[PDB]
UniProtKB/Swiss-Prot annotation:
It comes from the Bacteria. This is Nuclease A. Ca(2+) binds at residues 15, 34-35. Coiled coil: none annotated. The chain holds residues 89 to 223 of 231 of the full protein. It is found in: Secreted. Residues 109-129 are annotated as: Disordered.
């Protein structure tokens, strides 16, 4: 897969973010993860974790997988990198997202992310506490 440039417009929640991509504002949905909604337990902590990660980044990059690049709501589906660190993985590693929504074809980083989740569980972090 290939990393492409983008700029932060606005943090939304734990697993969605508004970015400018090829000069167009787009809501991005993080592949392969599910954060709780803001109105659920660990929702606010997830939102804050993603927000800090993208807001502190000097460089945001997106990486589409081999499959569907936009979902039924028009959100871009991507792995999003903040100064070279994947937000998707970082969520999971901290137990603020579960590996989820794993659809054939858009599953390149599945193994990396399940590995993170297994560690987060072993540590009983957040959701796993
Ligand atoms: C992450 C992801 C979500 N979705 C859709 C499936 C779910 O449909 P429904 O809205 O019908 O449940 C929804 C969950 O996204 P949220 O977790 O952001 O709600 O987003 C995809 O189609 N592909 C994906 O890769
Ligand atoms: Ca969610």
């Amino acid at each position: 897969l290939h990393k492409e440039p983008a700029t932060l417009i606005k943090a939304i929640d734990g697993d969605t973010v508004k970015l400018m991509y090829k000069g167009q504002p787009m809501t991005f949905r993080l592949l392969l993860v599910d954060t709780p909604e803001f109105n659920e337990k660990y929702g606010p902590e997830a939102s804050a974790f993603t927000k800090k990660m993208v807001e502190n980044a000097k460089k945001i990059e997106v990486e589409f997988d081999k499959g569907q690049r936009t979902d039924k709501y028009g959100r871009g589906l991507a792995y999003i990198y903040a100064d070279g660190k994947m937000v998707n993985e970082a969520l999971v590693r901290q137990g603020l997202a579960k590996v989820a929504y794993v659809y054939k074809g858009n599953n390149t980083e599945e193994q990396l992310l399940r590995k993170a989740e297994a560690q987060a569980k072993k540590e009983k972090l957040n959701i796993w506490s």
